[PDB]
DNA sequence: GCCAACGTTGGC
DNA sequence: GCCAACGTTGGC
């Protein structure tokens, strides 16, 4: 499901065909510490919760969205 | 001391 | 030149 790792999954919270990844760092020092990235319907990847508002515009309302789990969370 | 957010780089 | 992947750090 939602928590599972290493595969893009629907984000339903963003406009339709948004999908969302979290993928675990291997080597160096910061091993093993979790990240998240956003793709778009084009594709393009996001890698914060600014550059998604910076994209996304009025079409959205960030106020709330919790980018580490995709929902929104008032 | 942490981590959100971004800058840099190696490998292609 | 691109981009996944790691390093860096200002703001908290």
Redesign the pocket.
Request: charged share 45%; proline share 4%.
């Given at each position: 499901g939602a928590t599972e790792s290493g595969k893009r999954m629907d984000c339903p919270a963003l406009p339709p065909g948004w999908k969302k990844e979290e993928?675990?760092?291997?080597?160096?020092?910061?091993?093993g510490?979790s990240?998240?990235?956003y793709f778009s319907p084009s594709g393009?990847?996001f890698?914060?919760?600014?550059?998604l508002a910076?994209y996304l515009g009025n079409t959205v309302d960030l106020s709330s969205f919790d980018?580490?789990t995709g929902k929104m969370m008032p």
């Open positions: 993928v675990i760092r291997k080597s160096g020092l910061s091993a510490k990240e998240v990235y393009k990847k890698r914060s919760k600014p550059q910076r980018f580490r």
